[PDB]
Design a binder for this molecule. Structure first.
Ligand code: MET
Ligand SMILES: [Ca+2]
Ligand SMILES: [Zn+2]
Ligand SMILES: [Zn+2]
Length: 277
């Protein structure tokens, strides 16, 4: 797998920050900042050769969208998917929640095209709308997939909050093979990992997990407080939240830890290449 360049991921975060500032200060469902975010991600993918689909749905009286991107080729009967929600809450730009995961998945998709990668499994990437209203966009996607198509899913990898300013390195404990793939990557960097417990079923992997699709993912922490033992293994500040700007107006470009964002972007690419071979 390629090393994902941190500067390219940060450039996507800068564009999402400008989009929020030009649209009222947020990228929330039903507000202009959300569709403008979708348009930016779609344009980058279409230029790189992906087949893109916009899936529209209505929630809370307003139109939302999921953006699905398929890399042509690979086995149609074994699909590996990776995704991230693209909406924010209405209090701010949502740069760590979840510009961080959205930008890492987007740069991984661009890296597949730049590398001229031809995977054995078919690759599909998704950016979900309306996650902050209760996983509405990912539930819409799973509820509308025919059973024949659901059975072709080999795994779904989720990236939601991966650049927290006082980070921890948490790996989901769902499918064992996906979990081992991430743990082995961090082992090679000599960075310890812990099992994800703060978010539980509260992100877009839940609808997939509930229908039997293997899932996994990465998380760097939200409102919970980092312990002394955790600061000893990862640095940072014990007694402070992992993300002091969770769902706040201060979840801006300054609310990102570059080391954690780079490590988790590189781990995302490593898992995508490893599991699609
Ligand atoms: C990964 S669980 C914590 C984040 C939560 N899904 C959110 O969007 O706020
Ligand atoms: Ca990197
Ligand atoms: Zn989130
Ligand atoms: Zn959130």
């Amino acid at each position: 797998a390629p090393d994902i360049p941190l500067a390219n991921v940060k450039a996507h975060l800068t564009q999402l920050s400008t989009i929020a500032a030009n649209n009222g200060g947020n990228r929330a469902h039903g507000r202009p900042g959300y569709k403008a975010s979708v348009d930016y991600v779609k344009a980058k993918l279409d230029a790189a050769g992906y087949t893109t689909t916009l899936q529209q749905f209505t929630s809370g009286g307003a139109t939302g969208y999921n953006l699905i991107a398929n890399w042509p080729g690979g086995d149609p009967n074994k699909v590996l998917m990776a995704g991230a929600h693209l909406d924010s809450v209405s209090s701010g730009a949502g740069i760590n929640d979840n510009g961080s995961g959205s930008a890492a998945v987007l740069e991984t998709a661009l890296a597949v095209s730049r590398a001229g990668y031809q995977p054995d499994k078919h690759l599909r990437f998704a950016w979900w709308g309306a996650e902050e209203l209760g996983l509405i966009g990912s539930k819409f996607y799973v509820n509308n997939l025919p059973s024949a198509d659901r059975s072709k899913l080999a795994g779904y990898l989720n990236f939601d909050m991966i650049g927290s300013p006082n980070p921890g390195y948490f790996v989901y404990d769902d499918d064992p093979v996906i979990e081992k793939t991430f743990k082995n990557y961090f082992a090679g960097l000599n960075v310890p990992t812990e099992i994800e417990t703060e978010g539980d079923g509260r992100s877009d992997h839940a609808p997939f997990k509930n229908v039997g699709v293997p899932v996994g993912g990465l998380f760097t922490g939200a409102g919970y407080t980092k312990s002394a033992a955790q600061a000893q293994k990862w640095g940072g500040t014990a007694g402070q939240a992992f993300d002091r700007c969770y769902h706040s107006s201060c979840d801006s470009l300054s609310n990102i830890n570059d080391t954690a964002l780079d490590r988790n972007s590189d781990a995302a690419a490593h898992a995508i290449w490893t599991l699609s071979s």
